[PDB]
Amino acid sequence: SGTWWDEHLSEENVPFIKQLVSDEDKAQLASKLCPLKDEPWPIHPWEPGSFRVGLIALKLGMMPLWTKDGQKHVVTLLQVQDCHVLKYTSKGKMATLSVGGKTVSRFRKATSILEFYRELGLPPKQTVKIFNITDNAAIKPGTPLYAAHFRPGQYVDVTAKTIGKGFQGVMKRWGFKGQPATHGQTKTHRRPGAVATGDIGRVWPGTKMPGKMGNIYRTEYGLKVWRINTKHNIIYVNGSVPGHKNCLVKVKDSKLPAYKDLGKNLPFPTYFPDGDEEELPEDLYDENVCQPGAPSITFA
Amino acid sequence: AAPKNRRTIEVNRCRRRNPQKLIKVKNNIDVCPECGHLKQKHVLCAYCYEKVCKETAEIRRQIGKQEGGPFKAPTIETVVLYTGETPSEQDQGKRIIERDRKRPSWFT
Amino acid sequence: ISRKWEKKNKIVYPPQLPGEPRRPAEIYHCRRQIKYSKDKMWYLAKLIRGMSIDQALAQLEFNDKKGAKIIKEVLLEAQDMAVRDHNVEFRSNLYIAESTSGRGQCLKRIRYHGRGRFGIMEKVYCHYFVKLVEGPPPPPEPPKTAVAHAKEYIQQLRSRTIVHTL
Amino acid sequence: QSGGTTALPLYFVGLYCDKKLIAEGPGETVLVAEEEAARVALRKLYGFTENRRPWNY
Amino acid sequence: ISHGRVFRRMGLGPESRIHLLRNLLTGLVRHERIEAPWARVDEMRGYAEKLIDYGKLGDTNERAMRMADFWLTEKDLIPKLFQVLAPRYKDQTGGYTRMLQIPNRSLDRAKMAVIEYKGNCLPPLPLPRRDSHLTLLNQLLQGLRQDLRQSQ
Amino acid sequence: EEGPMIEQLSKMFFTTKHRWYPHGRYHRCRKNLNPPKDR
Amino acid sequence: TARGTPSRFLASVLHNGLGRYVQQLQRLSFSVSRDGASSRGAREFVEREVIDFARRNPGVVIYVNSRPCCVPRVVAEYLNGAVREESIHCKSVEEISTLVQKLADQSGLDVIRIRKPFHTDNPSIQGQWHPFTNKPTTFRGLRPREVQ
Amino acid sequence: SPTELTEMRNDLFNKEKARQLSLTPRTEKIEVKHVGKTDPGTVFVMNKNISTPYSCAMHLSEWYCRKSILALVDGQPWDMYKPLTKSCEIKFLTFKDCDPGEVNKAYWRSCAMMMGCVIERAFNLVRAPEVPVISGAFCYDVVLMPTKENLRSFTKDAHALIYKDLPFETLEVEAKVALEIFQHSKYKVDFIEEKASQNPERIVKLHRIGDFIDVSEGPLIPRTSICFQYEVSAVHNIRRFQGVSLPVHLRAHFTIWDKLLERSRK
Ligand SMILES: [Mg+2]
Ligand SMILES: [Mg+2]
Ligand SMILES: [Mg+2]
Numbered sequence A: 001s002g003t004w005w006d007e008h009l010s011e012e013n014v015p016f017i018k019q020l021v022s023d024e025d026k027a028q029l030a031s032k033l034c035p036l037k038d039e040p041w042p043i044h045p046w047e048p049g050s051f052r053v054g055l056i057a058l059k060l061g062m063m064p065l066w067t068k069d070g071q072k073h074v075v076t077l078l079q080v081q082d083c084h085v086l087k088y089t090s091k092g093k094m095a096t097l098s099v100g101g102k103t104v105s106r107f108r109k110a111t112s113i114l115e116f117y118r119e120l121g122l123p124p125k126q127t128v129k130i131f132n133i134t135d136n137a138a139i140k141p142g143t144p145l146y147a148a149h150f151r152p153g154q155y156v157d158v159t160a161k162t163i164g165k166g167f168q169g170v171m172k173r174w175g176f177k178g179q180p181a182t183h184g185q186t187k188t189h190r191r192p193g194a195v196a197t198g199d200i201g202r203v204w205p206g207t208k209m210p211g212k213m214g215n216i217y218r219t220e221y222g223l224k225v226w227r228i229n230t231k232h233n234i235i236y237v238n239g240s241v242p243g244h245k246n247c248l249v250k251v252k253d254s255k256l257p258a259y260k261d262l263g264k265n266l267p268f269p270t271y272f273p274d275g276d277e278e279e280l281p282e283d284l285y286d287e288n289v290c291q292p293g294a295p296s297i298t299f300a
Numbered sequence B: 001a002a003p004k005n006r007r008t009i010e011v012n013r014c015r016r017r018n019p020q021k022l023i024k025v026k027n028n029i030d031v032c033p034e035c036g037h038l039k040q041k042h043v044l045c046a047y048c049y050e051k052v053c054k055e056t057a058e059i060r061r062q063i064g065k066q067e068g069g070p071f072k073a074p075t076i077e078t079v080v081l082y083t084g085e086t087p088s089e090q091d092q093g094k095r096i097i098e099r100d101r102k103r104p105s106w107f108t
Numbered sequence C: 001i002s003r004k005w006e007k008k009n010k011i012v013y014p015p016q017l018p019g020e021p022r023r024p025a026e027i028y029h030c031r032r033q034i035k036y037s038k039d040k041m042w043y044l045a046k047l048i049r050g051m052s053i054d055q056a057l058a059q060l061e062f063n064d065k066k067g068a069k070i071i072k073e074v075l076l077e078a079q080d081m082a083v084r085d086h087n088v089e090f091r092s093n094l095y096i097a098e099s100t101s102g103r104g105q106c107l108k109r110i111r112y113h114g115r116g117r118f119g120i121m122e123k124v125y126c127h128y129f130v131k132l133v134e135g136p137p138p139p140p141e142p143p144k145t146a147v148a149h150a151k152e153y154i155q156q157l158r159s160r161t162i163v164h165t166l
Numbered sequence D: 001q002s003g004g005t006t007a008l009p010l011y012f013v014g015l016y017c018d019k020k021l022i023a024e025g026p027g028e029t030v031l032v033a034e035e036e037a038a039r040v041a042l043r044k045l046y047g048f049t050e051n052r053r054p055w056n057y
Numbered sequence E: 001i002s003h004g005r006v007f008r009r010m011g012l013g014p015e016s017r018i019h020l021l022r023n024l025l026t027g028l029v030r031h032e033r034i035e036a037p038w039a040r041v042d043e044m045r046g047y048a049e050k051l052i053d054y055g056k057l058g059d060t061n062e063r064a065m066r067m068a069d070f071w072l073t074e075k076d077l078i079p080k081l082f083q084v085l086a087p088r089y090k091d092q093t094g095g096y097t098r099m100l101q102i103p104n105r106s107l108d109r110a111k112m113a114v115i116e117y118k119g120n121c122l123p124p125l126p127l128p129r130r131d132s133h134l135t136l137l138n139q140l141l142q143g144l145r146q147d148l149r150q151s152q
Numbered sequence F: 001e002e003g004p005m006i007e008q009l010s011k012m013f014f015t016t017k018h019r020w021y022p023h024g025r026y027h028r029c030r031k032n033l034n035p036p037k038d039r
Numbered sequence G: 001t002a003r004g005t006p007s008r009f010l011a012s013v014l015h016n017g018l019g020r021y022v023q024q025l026q027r028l029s030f031s032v033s034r035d036g037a038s039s040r041g042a043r044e045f046v047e048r049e050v051i052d053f054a055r056r057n058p059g060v061v062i063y064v065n066s067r068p069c070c071v072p073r074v075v076a077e078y079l080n081g082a083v084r085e086e087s088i089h090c091k092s093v094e095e096i097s098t099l100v101q102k103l104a105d106q107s108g109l110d111v112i113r114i115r116k117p118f119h120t121d122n123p124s125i126q127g128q129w130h131p132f133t134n135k136p137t138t139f140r141g142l143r144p145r146e147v148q
Numbered sequence H: 001s002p003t004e005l006t007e008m009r010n011d012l013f014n015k016e017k018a019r020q021l022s023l024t025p026r027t028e029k030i031e032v033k034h035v036g037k038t039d040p041g042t043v044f045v046m047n048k049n050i051s052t053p054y055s056c057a058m059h060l061s062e063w064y065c066r067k068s069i070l071a072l073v074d075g076q077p078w079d080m081y082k083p084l085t086k087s088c089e090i091k092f093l094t095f096k097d098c099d100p101g102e103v104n105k106a107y108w109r110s111c112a113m114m115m116g117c118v119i120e121r122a123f124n125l126v127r128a129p130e131v132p133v134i135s136g137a138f139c140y141d142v143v144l145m146p147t148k149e150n151l152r153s154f155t156k157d158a159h160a161l162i163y164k165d166l167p168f169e170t171l172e173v174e175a176k177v178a179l180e181i182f183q184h185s186k187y188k189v190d191f192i193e194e195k196a197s198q199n200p201e202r203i204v205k206l207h208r209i210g211d212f213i214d215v216s217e218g219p220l221i222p223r224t225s226i227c228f229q230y231e232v233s234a235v236h237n238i239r240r241f242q243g244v245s246l247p248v249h250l251r252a253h254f255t256i257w258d259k260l261l262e263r264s265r266k
């Protein structure tokens, strides 16, 4: 990019500019905190064939969670930060919607991105994942999406990068058994033996060979949700999640055949704090989850 | 393992002329306000650094001349002076180490 | 042996007339016998071609290469000779026009392998030529836009005649 | 007319003189085609076309 | 793999690198200025941070005394350390060491830097002086701040 | 700008994206700048 | 070896075939040697053939250097400016005469690929062919798939 | 007939230049001194009727030519493309200095002149009001409704003028020729009369930008390429115009640019 901003600023304008940026961002967020008050477009009811908008949370860490049956179940952490809609585009094969996530400084960005994010409220985000939504649910840009969008007892898919191990060898990249230590190896312990046949003077495309492991987007299907938080906007999903800690992850509804027609009890468009909606408790629990503070279990 | 066919001059030229191997031009050369010896960003000057090094070497030589033999390291601070200049009333116990030199236009 | 770059500095042109251009003054200078390779010298020359003398010296003063100091000294000597001998007032109004680097007279030594053999170890020597032309540097040839490509295509399609007939 | 808005057209502009064409000529654009048609008409009027007489030696 | 790995390998092992860092720290405590590679420079700076912390913890403390006796091979810099670099910075907390950069070495061309304790009697270094406040952008920002203040 | 411009030129002239790129100095010098004037 | 040899389209120097016919041969300079066995043919020619050749076409002037030369040459200039400096080292009188006649008959045009032995200035008489030939015209010139 | 008026003004400017240059005494040389902060005590032996501090900068290095904006001779400001007289000290000014006030004032005056030129080329002027730099917006009243399209057109014209890259020719001329050049607009006549009455003599500084000429007081920017950014905030009330512009080597940012534009919009 061009010349970084912190170059022609004295020792007195840096903190002033920082405070001004923070105040402007906070004011924009507070102004956009009211979606229903502004034109929210007509809201449609639930239909058999129709999807909803997802979220983009941050993978904090992991912690265990015991169920009522007395069994250990690993659970992940997903912090829904801001998560606002950028724009909307109709017919490609189906409608699309852009969603952001974390709040990245608006100094190390392209002029086009800065102009696009200035046309709308809020500051520029980090990533922009496009979701393939139907024509039914259509939320206006600039609206927030907290963790209340999802509810317990639901399978939600997650996709994100992975802890890239760089250009790895062969065993760690594909799980090859390599060669023995003795009888009678001298320089062969992790190398790949034969390629493929002999007469074939070529190499079958896609053959397992040393390459850059990880550092790619991989989706996981079949992940149940146990508990959700409203204050901190945290989502606790079962099983691990691709990507390192403090890494943005794309989350949306599942796609399996056994979990497709069950969004009747879920909010078809998105959760709206302003209501005319009856606020939810501090955190919704599940039917098969040991609540924090409840008496000890007893299989009698 | 051995070359089966010598690389042609065209192939050699194409290999030793791509932008990936050519020296990448840099644009991080500014003008130093002191002595204008075109310094680099995030890096100190050249003539000023040499002057500071010479001054530090002279100060160390003077300290050694005053300290004497090795294995000393007194438990008192230091104060550098120049021609004239009465010692500061605040630093009276600190050992003064100097000889003969004029205060330059960049030392406090 | 063949010294010519040093003799080119003695070329004399007839006296110009009032109704004629200024004719930018050309400079020639080179150092013989340089304990250095030739590929790196050619790399440095290619790096310093379209740039001016000031930018060239600025890039050389921060180029981690043995030949950088040699090229800087050569450019300084050429600038001094141009300001003194060739008669030039402006010191920064000079730009590089030609820059090459050929091999020199190499010797031979022995390396001694790990057996009853060996190999010739030539002492690679090189040179360095530079041509500084008076006046500011010319602008770089910009990339032909789509309009130029369309015009060339139209010209090629219009400049076609029937083949194999009258 | 050949093509249209393809950057490589070829219009055959004519010149009707009281429902009686006197000449014609093609051209890249419409104005250039009309100019070429007028030039060919002037040629035909002056008898300078390629179908004239060679000479008498 | 080196995901979240600290301590850059330098010498032929942990003992060699820690001995080199100790020698560099001793040389700095003796002269208050050393020209070393950037890696070793930052490593010795991080080590001297904790060294000054221990020296500030107290002199009668057996732990600090043992640490000073170990990290200092000359054995003559312990009193100077404890009685100069601990009371002088009795007000600061973590503002020690001022790291910069050297152009390069005239031999093998290596990235070198300089580090020294603040308040030293040696001459000052050419620190990167920011642009003055009387410039165009600075004046515009000052006017904007004044207008924002007067808005209230 | 190279890729998009070449694609636009190809779509406009309905030609391939191979002849749009330039050629080395060999073919440039091999070209005859003084062709034989015919007719 | 045409790709590695220049070519030229067939054409005349001034269209002499239309009006008057002009001799393309300009001058001829013979470098005969008095004392030397390497110019007996040229000597016999200059003796008993050059006069007849010059009188057969008064539109050409010939010179006779007659200088101490080791190899006799002939400079055949032309109107356009071409020069054909050939050698006649050891050649019979008949051969030299035939060579001189050929030089006088030919023009100054280069001796390279003629390519297309024909220069038709106006090859089209009934109208040059174009893609819009031998085709009809519908009513009002309505292109296909056109209502109004 | 504005074209004829501009042509006559350019002809008068050329005639004044010829008159000022005819008095050259066969190129008289002088020995001017330079007292700067770097590389002392270098000197120069330039001319006294054609040479300019730009020649000294070129003799020194291209860095000064690209960074120098004003030359301080005897403590007074001077232009980069202006003939010098009386051998005295020479200095250089840039944007990153201890007291770059003269450079800021020159940049403000140059921006005002460029805004006036763009307004004149758009489709009667009055003068060039000297507004402080802290105001955050250069003003240029004009006697005669603007919209977003008009502001965009003015910005495009200013960008084109900057891309053209033309020098600022200055001349110290009396008030007679100044009035002869501006023998139509009464406001400019009164301004020139006041400027002449202020100075001890009738001498008045002038400026020329291709086909645009205007009167001012302090020096200006030599080349228009030094002005990187340039915009037009809005218009206020005979009609007072506004605008903001940043020079090269001080590229702020899109956010800072928008903030400065909003602050100037007043
Ligand atoms: Mg194994
Ligand atoms: Mg082994
Ligand atoms: Mg090692």
Ligand SMILES: [Zn+2]
Binding pocket: B032, B033, B034, B035, B036, B037, B045, B046, B047, B048
């Ligand atoms: Zn300096």
